[PDB]
Design a protein around this ligand. Structure first.
Ligand SMILES: NC(=O)/N=c1\s[nH]c(S[C@@H]2CCCCc3ccccc32)c1C(N)=O
Length: 289
């Protein structure tokens, strides 16, 4: 919408912080009640400097414009006091990495047990992330940090992409050149070596996300140290085919993992394939935690 261009400002008295949400990796995030927005449950992210407030509104102006069925909904801001507030939709089931691990074979055994994530459910998660990435490419927006830890799960296995690497570093990040914290395990050779981030580097990251989904949230290249990870990526080595991954899906991953960016599969093509596989293997089983 044209109207989304403009940042929605919310009154402080219409926000009631209820409890903490996440650990968290995104700083202090709260579960809150939001009145006269249409009351609803929301997620609140907090931020206290002339330049930092300038970047806050810049970030708010970017987030307001990115609106899609598979992008975490940005509701607006509250700049009435300290700290500054960012309001997002509440995603009941939290981060996708935690969700994948909670529905893994180990979680089923070491458990009222949870249900093991099925191949049909994996494909359903995959097509939704691919849909959100198709939208970002259409808006000429480069995420730069696509990973399951940056995706959120809602009701009816609804999955949405978020964060976009804005602000925020765990073991999933490496200090590239001793200067910038970057997610090396999810990055192609050109992003590690030259810090070139494009729609094509996001395609590589989507391939790694597909590997994360099919391995129940395992860390990519888990057997390796950070230096070994960079060596494998730059040399042209690939992640192994997951046990539960069909050959068709692994070949899609290989298409994302082409060494040169111009050789990688197009985002529209990746989404169309995942959409067709998910439609042919639909979700119908009960999902327990
Ligand atoms: N259940 C549960 O843990 N939900 C949580 S945890 N963190 C959040 S917002 C977080 C940071 C703000 C940008 C949006 C965003 C986008 C992707 C990942 C995290 C975040 C929620 C929520 N939106 O529901």
């Amino acid at each position: 919408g044209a109207m989304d261009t403009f940042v929605q400002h919310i009154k402080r008295h219409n926000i009631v912080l209820k409890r903490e949400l996440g650990e968290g990796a995104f700083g202090k995030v709260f579960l809150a009640e939001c009145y006269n927005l249409c009351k609803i449950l929301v997620a609140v992210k907090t931020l206290a400097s002339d330049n930092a407030r300038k970047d806050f509104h810049r970030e708010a102006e970017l987030l307001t414009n990115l609106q899609h069925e598979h992008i975490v909904k940005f509701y607006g801001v509250c700049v009435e006091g300290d700290p500054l507030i960012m309001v997002f939709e509440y995603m009941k089931h939290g981060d996708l990495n935690k969700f994948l691990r909670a529905h893994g074979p180990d979680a089923v055994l070491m458990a009222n047990p949870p249900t093991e994530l099925t191949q049909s459910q994996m494909l359903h998660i995959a097509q939704q992330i691919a849909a959100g990435m198709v939208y970002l490419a259409s808006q000429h927006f480069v995420h730069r940090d696509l990973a399951t830890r940056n995706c959120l799960v809602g009701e009816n296995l609804l999955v949405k992409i978020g964060d976009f690497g804005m602000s925020r570093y765990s073991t999933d990040y490496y200090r590239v050149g001793g200067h910038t914290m970057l997610p090396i395990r999810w990055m192609p050779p050109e992003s590690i070596m030259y810090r070139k981030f494009t729609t094509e580097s996001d395609v590589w990251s989507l391939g790694v996300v597909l590997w994360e989904i099919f391995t129940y949230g395992k860390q990519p290249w888990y057997q390796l140290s950070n230096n070994e990870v960079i060596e494998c990526i730059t040399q042209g080595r690939v992640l192994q085919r997951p046990r539960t991954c069909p050959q068709e899906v692994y070949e899609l991953m290989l298409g994302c993992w082409q060494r040169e960016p111009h050789m990688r599969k197009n985002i529209k093509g990746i989404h169309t394939l995942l959409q067709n596989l998910a439609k042919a293997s639909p979700v119908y089983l009960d999902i327990l935690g």
